[PDB]
RNA sequence: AAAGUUAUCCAAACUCGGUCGUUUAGAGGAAGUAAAAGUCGUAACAAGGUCUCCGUAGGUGAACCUGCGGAGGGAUCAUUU
Ligand SMILES: [Mg+2]
Ligand SMILES: [Mg+2]
Ligand SMILES: [Mg+2]
Ligand SMILES: [Mg+2]
C-alpha cells in the first residue's frame with residue numbers, strides 16, 4: 011500500500027487579476043460588508 | 056546826517072551730475088480667451104477596450120508613452136490544517 015504525497019501552494023493576486031480569473035466577484039451594496047468565508051458544500055447533492 | 060564802502064548771516068534763482076516714481080515707441084520671440092460647416096489622430100468617462108490618479112526623471116508630430124516609490128476617489132470590505 012502506498013500514499014501519494016500532497017503539494018502545498020499559496021497563491022496571491024492583485025485585485026485586477028483576481029476578478030478576471032473569477033477568484034472573487036462583484037457583490038451587492040449590502041452584501042459587501044460580510045467577511046465570513048463561504049460555506050463549502052458538504053453534501054455535493 | 057544821505058550816496059557810497061568792509062566782513063558775517065538769512066537765502067530766492069539758474070547750470071551740471073546722481074537717484075526714485077508715473078506715462079509711452081520698438082524689429083523679433085512666446086502664451087491666453089473667443090469665434091469657426093477646417094486638417095490629423097482617439098488620451099479620458101463601461102474592466103473606455105494597457106484599471107484611473109499623485110510626486111519625480113527621461114523620450115516622442117500631437118494628444119501621450121515608459122522607469123522607481125506611493126494612494127483607492129477600484130473592477131476586492133470575504134477563503135478555513
Ligand atoms: Mg514694452
Ligand atoms: Mg509684436
Ligand atoms: Mg489611458
Ligand atoms: Mg478607471
Ligand SMILES: [Mg+2]
Nearest residue numbers: 107127128129
Ligand atoms: Mg467611483
